Design a protein around this nucleic acid. Structure first.
Lengths: 261, 102
RNA sequence: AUUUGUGGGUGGUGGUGCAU
């Protein structure tokens, strides 16, 4: 149980953040980050009631001052809650400018984005509109290449789904650095999407979406060389079996004529 | 009269917004004065104390060790490229004519 | 130890009738 003075100060700070979107943040917020109990202070202050600009300022302060793990966990929780709340509040599932700024700050934070936030959004299963908005934001502000490759590999290792597929499409649009292991993960995701004729699979025999088709087309256009002869033939087989008509032909052609690592 | 009442209503709402901003600033100042120290003392007196991560670390190590990237753009139409070249040639010819003119 | 010299992409968190 927090003290009475602690609860009063946290409530005052939370109310100030809720009612303040412009001006200067309180010294309570300025000194909260200087302590070790950041999570406890946030929980006592109930930061879920803050305003969008105040939330963006708090996220920027946490990124600039707080450490790796503490700011990562705080960003994960606060960003997931705020994204869900904003998606629910907006009828067309739209975000605010301050929300986008906070998202850019979180993406710049490498550990808090992929491990903390992107892992949280994907694990919670962001909807199709949320995944599309996230892909747009990532294409706007791409993160460092190492984090991008790690996130692409994590999405490929994760099962095929709307969020993982949209993340893969955004990564393909970004065209980051694909290592041997990154290309192997991409080929593994393509194989998991493709069907197998002793034990079959739901994702194997399922039909891919238009976003997945566009992602496959971009991947065939870009990372053909990262795929060897065997992986290129596997991509051609995927385009033949679980490919498309308007995009499947280009996928098969690029898989047949692409370079090898 | 309608425009005068419009100006009056706009000024009244602007004054209400300014008063709200002043009240918010006063509340924030009071928070910074008292609640800041209270929360600092309370936090000083109190305390508040992986597969995906491993896969990401392995992927990052592999990306640092090796890489094979080919950011090749989509191929355009030959007719479109020829038309663009013709337009560039026309612009160059126009520039040459202008230079000859002065 | 994130940043620089050099290249380089760059419009639709678009409006939009109509059918469904």
């Amino acid at each position: 149980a927090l003290p009475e003075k602690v609860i009063k100060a946290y409530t005052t700070v939370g109310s100030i953040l809720k009612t303040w979107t412009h001006g200067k943040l309180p010294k309570l917020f300025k000194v909260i980050p200087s302590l070790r109990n950041w999570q406890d202070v946030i929980y006592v202050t109930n930061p879920e009631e803050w305003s969008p600009h105040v939330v963006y300022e708090a996220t920027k302060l946490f990124v600039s001052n707080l450490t790796a793990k503490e700011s990562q966990k705080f960003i994960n929780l606060i960003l997931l809650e705020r994204f869900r709340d904003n998606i629910e509040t907006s009828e067309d599932h739209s975000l605010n400018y301050h929300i986008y700024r906070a998202v850019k700050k979180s993406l710049y934070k490498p550990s808090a984005f992929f491990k903390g936030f992107l892992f949280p959004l994907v694990e919670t299963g962001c909807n199709v509109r949320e995944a599309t908005i996230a892909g747009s934001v990532l294409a706007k502000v791409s993160v460092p290449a190492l984090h991008s490759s790690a996130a692409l590999s994590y999405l490929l290792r994760l099962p095929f789904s709307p969020p993982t597929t949209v993340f893969i499409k955004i990564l393909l649009d970004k065209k980051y650095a694909l290592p041997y292991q990154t290309v192997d993960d991409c080929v593994y995701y393509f194989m998991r999407f493709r069907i197998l004729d002793g034990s079959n699979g739901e994702d194997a025999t399922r039909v891919l979406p238009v976003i997945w088709h566009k992602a496959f087309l971009t991947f065939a256009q870009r990372y053909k060389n990262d795929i060897t002869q065997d992986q290129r033939d596997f991509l051609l087989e995927t385009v033949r079996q679980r490919g498309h008509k308007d995009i499947g032909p280009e996928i098969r052609r690029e898989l047949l004529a692409g370079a090898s690592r | 009269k309608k425009t005068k009442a419009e100006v009056m209503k706009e000024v009244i709402a602007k004054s209400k917004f300014y008063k709200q901003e002043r009240q918010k600033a006063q509340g924030i100042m009071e928070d910074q004065i008292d609640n800041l120290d209270d929360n600092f003392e309370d936090v000083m007196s109190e305390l508040m104390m992986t597969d995906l991560d491993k896969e990401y670390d392995i992927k990052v190590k592999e990306l640092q060790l090796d890489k094979r990237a080919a950011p090749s753009d989509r191929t355009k139409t030959e007719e479109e490229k020829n038309a663009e070249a013709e337009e560039k040639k026309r612009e160059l010819e126009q520039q040459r004519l202008d230079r000859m003119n002065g």
